[PDB]
Amino acid sequence: SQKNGIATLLQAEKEAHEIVSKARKYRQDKLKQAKTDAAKEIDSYKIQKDKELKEF
Amino acid sequence: LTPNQVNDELNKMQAFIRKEAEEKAKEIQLKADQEYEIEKTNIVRNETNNID
Amino acid sequence: DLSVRSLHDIVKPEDFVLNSEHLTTVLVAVPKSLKSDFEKSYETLSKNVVPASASV
Numbered sequence A: 001s002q003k004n005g006i007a008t009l010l011q012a013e014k015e016a017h018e019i020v021s022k023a024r025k026y027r028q029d030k031l032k033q034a035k036t037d038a039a040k041e042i043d044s045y046k047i048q049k050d051k052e053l054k055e056f
Numbered sequence B: 001l002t003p004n005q006v007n008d009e010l011n012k013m014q015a016f017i018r019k020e021a022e023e024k025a026k027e028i029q030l031k032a033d034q035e036y037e038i039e040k041t042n043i044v045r046n047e048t049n050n051i052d
Numbered sequence C: 001d002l003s004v005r006s007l008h009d010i011v012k013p014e015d016f017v018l019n020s021e022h023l024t025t026v027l028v029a030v031p032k033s034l035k036s037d038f039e040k041s042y043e044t045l046s047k048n049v050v051p052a053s054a055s056v
Helices: A002-054 B003-051 C035-045
Strands: none
Touching: A002 B003, B003 C035
């Protein structure tokens, strides 16, 4: 039963590693995302201030 | 070994393997939300002062 | 003699691991008098032992 008990628990670990690997992926996505959603706030704030200069 | 001792460890260990998988992925993606905010705020506030 | 010997002419992924994330393999040199005592006790010696892995 050597090759059934070791084989099954090890496969469990191969699944366990894959879930951890998805959450690492998730975290990389959130870094790229962060630069992206900060870019959309600057250039809308930029033109708001440019609005009130043009009003002036 | 006997047949019960063999199943007793198999159920207990595979529980742990799952518990440790869940615990590590959940902590890493918990940190992913936090870290997103730090960086989005940081990039904005530095460059908003530059706009001002 | 087992006090400086560990196998390395042969290497199999079901007798040796350490490139998992959860699993390792530790080799125990047990005296031949103590041998039957090792098969009975090994599971119980620590928690979370892979069932039926003890073989010579």
